[PDB]
Write an enzyme that holds these catalytic residues in place. Structure first.
Site, mmCIF file in Angstrom:
data_model
loop_
_atom_site.group_PDB
_atom_site.id
_atom_site.type_symbol
_atom_site.label_atom_id
_atom_site.label_comp_id
_atom_site.label_asym_id
_atom_site.label_seq_id
_atom_site.Cartn_x
_atom_site.Cartn_y
_atom_site.Cartn_z
ATOM 1 N N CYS C 1 -2.460 1.883 11.918
ATOM 2 C CA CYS C 1 -1.075 1.893 11.415
ATOM 3 C C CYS C 1 -0.412 0.609 11.902
ATOM 4 O O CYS C 1 -0.701 0.127 13.013
ATOM 5 C CB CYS C 1 -0.321 3.101 11.988
ATOM 6 N N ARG C 15 5.990 0.321 6.888
ATOM 7 C CA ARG C 15 4.687 0.486 7.522
ATOM 8 C C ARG C 15 3.512 0.633 6.591
ATOM 9 O O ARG C 15 3.641 1.042 5.445
ATOM 10 C CB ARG C 15 4.722 1.701 8.485
#
Lengths: 323, 323, 323, 323
Positions: C1, C15
């Site tokens: 991530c 993100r």
């Protein structure tokens, strides 16, 4: 600075001393009855004998590193901007960094004994004199079983078990150990072609398993290179072959003159390298301009004396003219 | 293998000899009237005197590296899979690689003279009436002004000017030079924070200008590290400070035993490091297990002799016991 | 991530969500009167509206990341082996990680407000259900002024100011920031030849200032690459150009399918990338197999509703067939 | 610039076009009866149809890259300082680099046919006009079986088989392939701890097998990253999944604006990325500020025409507003 342990039947402990200028370094044997006076804890009138290399711009043994007669070693290494020394604290053993090597090596025969002594330690900001202010340091201690790291920072006093027997400079030791996780794939053997099974890649050189090993003279890079070189070293279990390998490990992370310009016309460079045999009480060293290994054996001195025994270091090249 | 040149006041030339085993290396002085016989070119009955380390297993001087009395040096380095030797070719000077050091150093007093002799060289695939030990090699030659690289590959014979005075193993020298372009930013000084002007990045260690320098023991990495270390070296012009720096430069790319596992409990390691003073005809060396520098001066022998003068190498650790 | 902030007249937050399996992700707008019930702290019957991507289960908004109507954003990122959640602690605000995004974004309009709310947080080990145990996570939060990182580990709860507006996975944030110090030399411009003034080195490509930048898909390497790419990005201060640059920054650290094998022929890859405009309440996203950017504007919904407004994601490639 | 091939079920060919400015790139279909006039070789009045992106500054199709109706593709990539074009040479097919894509793709249905045609090629230094001098280029060509690289340098004309189906910028292709040898150990899987069996090293992140992969935007680093990302890619065989993976591969080596400052407020950045289906004659592209994939299918035009069919590129962001 780089300090290491290495075992090859005997247990060796030693360091590269890396700095810009040479301040009358000497080999100092402190005998059992040289009284140690401490500023804020009790004196040690009788203690273990010690041999090490000291600054010796004073009568007091200002050790950079040393070993005692029981096979415990200790070394101070630069820790600039990370070291934090404290106010006197009531209820602690308040010991100045300049006293710290005598304090530990004088009374402890093992690393486990040191750990117990370190439980109440507070490393206090008390200068040797106004002439000689404290260096920012951290320490490696090692016996014939194990090693630890001692770091006093703004967060407090930490004592680490050292699984690799290496220390360098900044940052803190937990980071140094962590960073090793990035290097797991490095090998002493021929690396496999994992890149793709669909193409042929040629092993055109030996040593390709180490690709990724960093070669610069910075603290973290030396830590990784020393650790890899130490843990994969091989040598006969004979004295001469063992100390040869030890000095080869230290050579792999030495700092050559000219490569670390710290400003002025000054360079940080490896002034000396040491190798101490913990079992035998022998301090070996080489210096930047003397490649011949010199040995000083603490057990050849009278360890019941009261007075420091100080030997100058051989600093000029000792060449064998074979004809 | 790594060979370098380095100038202080005198001009120095030398190498790390890296291999899996030490087997009878010797310092051999070939005097002027030791006849050199060649298989396909004319003999050299009278020639320049030469001093070098040779494979002691032949009755002929099989040099790994050597210098002559005029200050011309030459070293053969491993080049496995790249070296290509040729059929005898009419109109060329057909010289075997095992003859090549005596061929050049016997009759050339400078690198410029060697370039002329190399114009019609054909390096031929000979050791007489058998099959081939012939090692795959390439060469560094250097005098008090210059160095060059000689490579015979499948593409032909190439002679390169060497702007950095370094050579290692594979691949070809144009690739080695090219690869240096990737390292242009490396510095001996503190690096500027170019990463971003919006954040504060801490210089937590000295030596950080070198980050990116490779520290593995493969050929290309050793080329880069030796080159950066040599070019940024500093020393006083005294003989002892100069050779000290020279052996430091070589130490930076030595191979420690244990780190290059080639199978069969064998390791490629630095069997010896040499430093030759071209002006003075002195061959200095250190060996893996003898850290003391040993010196053999060609000008102390009778150079009008007919017979080889051979000194065994000091290979056991020579320690100065100071107490 | 990987989560970032980036400013180009508006302030963007978003993100890459990197994982080996999708849990049926949706865009979920939580209106002001959707009651948030909490296990151990007081309910929020009326709160700020929120838009984000959530795991698609139709009874509570389990957000991976989200922004509120006041311009505060929050994202949960994998922190496996580092995250430590705690027992209920008397005198703290005991909040489960699954509640944490609603808890903060429901009541805080700024990062400074969130810092005050976090002062007595204790992140408690309370599962959403037995069917859906807690993930190990850490968080980035950002408003139009600044960003912070929140990490609850075995040592405790830490809240860091984030000077680079980037977060990835392990290890702790202090190490991530510290490691950037190793990259200070990296430049967007042509690097100078500091290597040696005595030789010519050629700039044979653009982009050479970035040499050293790591390109692997691991957590620390993505942190460094994202940070460099983010801090040195340029774009027009127009919406379309700004969000384009944002998605370019995220693309620079996305995980392609096939490159991170996590074992059972499963691969960690970037399932979606988001970009939220903090000023405008717009959630933009791209998905692994849909390169077109899709936009969901929270302000086009009735924010006084009681019920979640859920949009399924566009997951099939949307191609413009131009002829 | 980066060009790649990738096979799923169909064979794809395409490139990132990296440059300091976008100025009138267009998709140009050259139909079979658009006469190609050549300066020094015979004309091609009737030839294969071609679709590609061209510089829209002339009536002549000045292709950056293109494919023909038989499934042969060709791309010109920047090769500044390495490209060398020649004088007209008698008995060669003297073809200018601006004519070279038409010359090949007009008459060759396969890479094997192009290798034959290239046997007598001499790439000549003849400008399109004095207003528009020749760019320094090299070329990748690919069909449904293989790819090759064409480089005309000061050493001559070389045609290389390309075993990895990737090309970037400088240096020469033999170097690019060689350098891949340095990366053999890189893996998509978890790397073993080969560093030392005596210590525990933690796999604190996924994707650690790629550590060492370079992430900067320079030519050699992009070659390595692209090659690793291409060869280890996986995707479903559907058209849409195949081209998504393709654009993910090219994304991994795109140049974000701001990161390669070439002076004068200009940046080298990826102006467009293409993906061509060789079997189907479809040219897909994305642009720096339009993330949506656009598709132009050559087989929907009348390929018997005489005139160029030109489509402007979609260069503004095409957002799907779902709300």
């Amino acid at each position: 600075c780089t300090a290491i342990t290495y075992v090859s039947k005997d247990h060796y402990f030693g360091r590269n001393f890396d700095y810009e200028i040479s301040y009358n370094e000497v080999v100092t044997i402190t005998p059992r009855n040289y009284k140690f006076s401490f500023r804020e804890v009790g004196n040690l009138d009788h203690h273990f004998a010690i041999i090490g290399i000291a600054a010796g711009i004073a009568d007091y043994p200002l050790y950079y590193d040393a070993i005692n007669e029981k096979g415990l070693g200790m070394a101070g290494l630069n820790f600039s901007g990370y070291a934090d020394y404290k106010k006197i604290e009531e209820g602690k053993e308040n010991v100045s960094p300049f006293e710290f090597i005598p304090w530990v090596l004088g009374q402890c025969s093992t690393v486990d004994e040191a750990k117990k002594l370190l439980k109440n330690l507070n490393l206090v900001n008390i200068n040797f004199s106004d002439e000689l202010p404290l260096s920012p340091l951290h320490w490696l201690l090692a016996d014939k079983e194990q090693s630890i790291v001692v770091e006093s920072t703004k967060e407090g006093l930490r004592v680490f078990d050292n699984p690799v027997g290496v220390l360098t400079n900044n940052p803190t030791f937990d980071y140094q150990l962590f960073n090793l996780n990035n290097y797991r794939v490095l090998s002493t053997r021929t690396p496999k072609n994992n890149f793709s099974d669909q193409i042929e890649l040629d092993i055109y050189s030996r040593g390709m398993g180490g690709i990724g090993l960093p070669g610069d003279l910075s603290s973290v890079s030396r830590f990784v290179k020393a650790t890899f070189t130490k843990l994969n070293s091989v040598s006969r279990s004979s004295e001469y072959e063992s100390i040869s390998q030890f000095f080869h490990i230290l050579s792999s992370v030495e700092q050559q003159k000219g490569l670390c310009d710290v400003g002025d016309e000054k360079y940080e460079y490896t002034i000396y390298s040491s190798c101490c045999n913990l079992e035998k009480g022998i301090y070996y060293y080489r210096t930047y301009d003397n490649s011949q290994i010199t040995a000083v054996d603490m057990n050849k001195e009278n360890l019941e004396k009261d007075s420091l025994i100080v030997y100058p270091m051989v600093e000029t090249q000792q060449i064998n003219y074979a004809n």
